[PDB]
Amino acid sequence: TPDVFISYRRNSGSQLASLLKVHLQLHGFSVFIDVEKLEAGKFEDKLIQSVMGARNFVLVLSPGALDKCMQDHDCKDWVHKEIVTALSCGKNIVPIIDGFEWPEPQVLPEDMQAVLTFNGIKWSHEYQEATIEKIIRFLQ
Amino acid sequence: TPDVFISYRRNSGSQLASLLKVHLQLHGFSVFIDVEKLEAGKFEDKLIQSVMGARNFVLVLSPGALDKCMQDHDCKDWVHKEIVTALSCGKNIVPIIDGFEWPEPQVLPEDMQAVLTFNGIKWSHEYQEATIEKIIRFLQ
Ligand SMILES: C[C@@H](c1cc[n+]([C@@H]2O[C@H](COP(=O)(O)OP(=O)(O)OC[C@H]3O[C@@H](n4cnc5c(N)ncnc54)[C@H](O)[C@@H]3O)[C@@H](O)[C@H]2O)cc1)N(C)C(=O)N[C@@H]1COCC1(F)F
Ligand SMILES: C[C@@H](c1cc[n+]([C@@H]2O[C@H](COP(=O)(O)OP(=O)(O)OC[C@H]3O[C@@H](n4cnc5c(N)ncnc54)[C@H](O)[C@@H]3O)[C@@H](O)[C@H]2O)cc1)N(C)C(=O)N[C@@H]1COCC1(F)F
């Protein structure tokens, strides 16, 4: 059962999300990212269970990463579903900020507005190792 | 003296470039990427000498990566400068395709059109380890 769940928006954060996976594994954390760990069966159940099972929830805020969450009030967007599950289970949420612009809370669905109240880490392209060490301090 | 020089477009390839660096280092290559190895002094000479110093030239073709090379006949664009140096020195050039569209040769300045004649490696989000293993087979 993975220590860390990495949630990300494919069209804009795939590369950073995989970069985060490599570094965290090199530092001894078990990591769930879909392309390495989402295997057979109905994926809706497996994904939700993977979030529920992970102590740490690493949220890759690339540019526009929460845009498809906006007005998703049936909760059909997958980042939205993953965040609400992490919030509902009281996980240690660690937002990683990479060119993300902070939205107004009211533009996000009520069941995920609390994600903006967690302290985020700025991804520094020039000081990546320092960025990684800070992330590890945030993790449990 | 690094074996591998990674050339890349910051606004679209920085994450993949850094991910390539970490994997190549794990497999024992000395890698030059600017944010880790470009240090003090006039950077023009330092960059060109660093291309000259590496046997392998890894070119990250993220979407639109060559767009600023087009009509750069003054040769002010840094990706343009790095490619021309690599071609001129007869380097082992290894393009990494990440959503790149192949342009018609004639839209590119004459001194870099030969970059399109090198066999490129498709970057696979779902089979990243296999992509890396292929890149290593291409290196010298
Ligand atoms: C449904 C999709 C999925 C979506 C979202 N997340 C989580 O949500 C975040 C990313 O959200 P987001 O950027 O908005 O992604 P979408 O725009 O929804 O991608 C939708 C695209 O998925 C493809 N597609 C649709 N139906 C299936 C299917 N039945 N089987 C396989 N592929 C499918 C298709 O190409 C479509 O365009 C992130 O945190 C992640 O953990 C995980 C998995 N899926 C099962 C896979 O990709 N499975 C791949 C095969 O095994 C490993 C794998 F996961 F890589
Ligand atoms: C000039 C620039 C540079 C440009 C290009 N490449 C090579 O060209 C590829 C990327 O092409 P590309 O996406 O088109 O880059 P540009 O948009 O041209 O960058 C322009 C931006 O650079 C900043 N900027 C400008 N003047 C200086 C300066 N005197 N000192 C520090 N920063 C400067 C500024 O922010 C501007 O916006 C890639 O393969 C790489 O090897 C290497 C270095 N430079 C020296 C640095 O960034 N130095 C940083 C300090 O050490 C680590 C470092 F290397 F990161």
Structural domains of chain B sorted by starting position, each given as residue range(s) with its CATH number in brackets: 4-138 (3.40.50.10140)
Contacts of A88 (CB under 8 A, 6+ apart): none
Pair B58, B6: CB distance under 8 Å? yes
* Radius of gyration (C-alpha) of chain B in whole angstroms: 14
- What technique solved it? X-ray
The dihedral built from the CA positions of residue B97, B98, B103 and B107, taken in this order, carries a sign that is: negative
CA of B106 to the centre of ligand 2 (A): 27
**B82 alpha carbon, closest ligand:** 2
Which protein residue has the closest C-alpha to ligand 2 atom 15?
A: B10
Which protein residue has the closest C-alpha to ligand 2 atom 42?
A: B34
Active site includes B133? no
Which protein residue has the closest C-alpha to ligand 2 atom 8?
A: B78
**Residues on chain B touching A23 (C-beta within 8 angstroms):** 22
Q: How far apart are CA A56 and CA A11, in angstroms?
A: 23
Cβ-Cβ pairs closer than 8 A, A with B, add up to 28
Give the pairing type, strands B4-7 and A56-61. unpaired
**From the alpha carbon of B7, which atom of ligand 2 is closest?**
39
- Report the residue from A10, A14, A128 with minimal CB separation from B18: A128
Return the DSSP state at A91. -
Q: Is B98 in the pocket of ligand 2 (CB under 6 A)?
A: no
Q: How far apart are CA B74 and CA A117, in angstroms?
A: 49
- Take residue B131 and report the two structure tokens written for it: 């992509």
Q: Which of B107, B98, B106, B96 is nearest to B138 (CA)?
A: B96
Resolution (Å) of this entry: 2.1
Count the Cβ atoms, other than its own, within 10 Å of residue B20: 25
The amino acid present at B65, given as its one-letter code, is A
Pair A87, A118: CB distance under 8 Å? no
Tell me the CA distances in angstroms from A99 to A61, A83, B2, B42, B58, one per residue in order: 8, 19, 30, 29, 26
Helix, strand, coil in percent for chain B, rounding step 5: 50, 15, 35
Q: How far apart are CA B126 and CA B107, in angstroms?
A: 32
Q: How far apart are CA B81 and CA B33, in angstroms?
A: 15
**From the alpha carbon of B8, which atom of ligand 2 is closest?**
39
